[model samples]
Target: YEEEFTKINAVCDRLTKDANAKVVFLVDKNGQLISSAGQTQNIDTTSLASLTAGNVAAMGGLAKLIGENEFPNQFHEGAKDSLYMTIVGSRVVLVVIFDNRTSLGLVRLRIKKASDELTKIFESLV
Candidate 1:
């Protein structure tokens, strides 16, 4: 398991640089941070984990309220910062944080490819 986790982290690190991003974190479905890389000292993992789960849980309600089938992906853009997070499934979550130094299009493309790879790896673990 440790070796597998390391492999996952390595993949994330490579994708982060490829996309010219700042941080990447992998969390389990239960909201535990598995591995992280890049600038992420100020960010609270515990809080972020809870928030991620809460966001996913809220999706059902949100969908009901807005009359949508799903919540899609979640993206938050602040004045000087941006966060992109996606729930791969009830098994894992991938998060990427970046600044204005990188373009959203590039990061999105990188993450999409990485996410597909990660999904295959995680499914095998199960």
Candidate 2:
């Protein structure tokens, strides 16, 4: 259990640097924060994690409305900061907080790599 946890922590750390993100975190489907990396001291991660999970869950309900599968990705663009949320293996929410310093394209590419690694880590956990 702890081994997987450490591996995930390293993955988050790598993604933060690779994506040039302000923060990177993982949230369980049940609204629990698993881990976070980067400049997280100013952010209220617990609430952020809870809300992110809720947002994904609520979105899933909306997906059912149109007979769509769950959205694997969500992106919110802002003038100075942006948010990118993606699901890994349908088990955890991978969130990236970035700013104008990074492009969405860069973040997305890094996330794809990070998510694949994370998916493997989670798969091994079970």
Candidate 3:
């Protein structure tokens, strides 16, 4: 568990630096906060994680009803900030918070590769 947790941190660090995100975090499907990086001191990650999981769950269920496998990603935009939320496999939620300094396209590109990497890491956990 410790080793995997450290890897998760590495993933977050790499993502934050490369994506220029304010922060990046992983949350379990059940809303447990797994890891995080960046300016999290001002972020309520506990609440954000819980809410992110819930939102992903609700949307995923809705998608399945329409014959979609899963709604793996979504974005919520604010006046000066936005959220890039992606689900890794079916087990974890990865989130990136950023401002207008970066484009969503870049975030999505970075997240796709990171998600692939994290899926392999979390697979060993079970």
Candidate 4:
């Protein structure tokens, strides 16, 4: 798991550079931070994990309420920053963080490609 996680983080770091982003990280479905790269720290992983999981669960519920078959990708934008997160079923979560240096559309596209690659890597891990 650790080896696979390292590869995932490396890929995320590379993608971050390609997208001109500052930071990237990954979390499990339970929201535990698996790995992080670039300039980011001082985070409370336990709390973050719970919060992310809650968000994903809520989204899932909302999808069900709307009669959707599945919850799509999720993103959160703030005043000075943005987070692009995608849940890979109940297994893992891929996350990328960026600033105003990059547009949401660019980040979204890069993240989509990274997510697909990461999903294949993770699927092999299982």
Task: State the lDDT of candidate 3 residue by residue for 47-93, as single tens digits.
Answer: 98889888988988899899988877888889898988888988888
Query: Which has the better lDDT: candidate 1, or candidate 2?
Result: 2
For residues 8-74, what per-residue lDDT tens digits would candidate 4 score against the true structure? 7777787878777777767776667776777766766567667877777788789889998555577
Quick one: best TM-score, which candidate?
2
Q: For candidate 3, give the lDDT.
A: 0.88
lDDT by residue (85-106, candidate 2, tens digit) is 9999987999999997687789
lDDT of 1 at 20: 80
lDDT of 2: 0.90
Q: Report the CA-based lDDT of candidate 1 relative to the real structure.
A: 0.77
- How many residue pairs collide in each prediction? 0, 0, 0, 0
TM-score for candidate 3? 0.91
Instruction: State the lDDT at 44 in candidate 2.
Output: 93
Worst 10 residues of 2 by lDDT: 1-10
Candidate 2 Cα deviation (angstroms), residue 84: 0.3
Taking the tens digit of each residue's C-alpha lDDT, what string does model 1 give over 1-126? 566777788878987789787888887657787778787789898888777767766764787788776544568897776888766644577888888667989988888888887877788786
